[PDB]
Amino acid sequence: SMSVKKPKRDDSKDLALCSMILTEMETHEDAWPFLLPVNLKLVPGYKKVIKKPMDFSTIREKLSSGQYPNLETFALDVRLVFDNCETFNEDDSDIGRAGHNMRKYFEKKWTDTFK
Numbered sequence: 864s865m866s867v868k869k870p871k872r873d874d875s876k877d878l879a880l881c882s883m884i885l886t887e888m889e890t891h892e893d894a895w896p897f898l899l900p901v902n903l904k905l906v907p908g909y910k911k912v913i914k915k916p917m918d919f920s921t922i923r924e925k926l927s928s929g930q931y932p933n934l935e936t937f938a939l940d941v942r943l944v945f946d947n948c949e950t951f952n953e954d955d956s957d958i959g960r961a962g963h964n965m966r967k968y969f970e971k972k973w974t975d976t977f978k
Contacts, residue, residue, distance in 0.1 A: 891965060
């Protein structure tokens with residue numbers, strides 16, 4: 864509350880550390896469905912159904928330009944990419960499997976870097 868704060872957790876390396884995680888997600892062999900925005904002209908239904916499209920290149924640009932206020936808003940966008948994927952793709956598809964795999968890969972790196 865006013866003049867009552869928990870001890871100050873050091874957040875000075877968060878930017879650099881999120882950048883490293885995102886590099887690792889970008890270079891994963893199963894990243895290919897997620898590297899670029901879904902083409903809303905060429906994929907029927909996507910625009911209407913997925914209210915908030917997100918992809919790795921859009922996260923990279925937001926990160927590099929100071930549009931994440933803290934590490935939690937970064938994680939929310941990464942999770943949005945996988946939540947979108949699950950909304951549009953059957954589990955038993957190459958893309959649906961890719962999204963599950965990448966979500967796991969991310970959540971481990973997230974815990975090991977910060978928790």
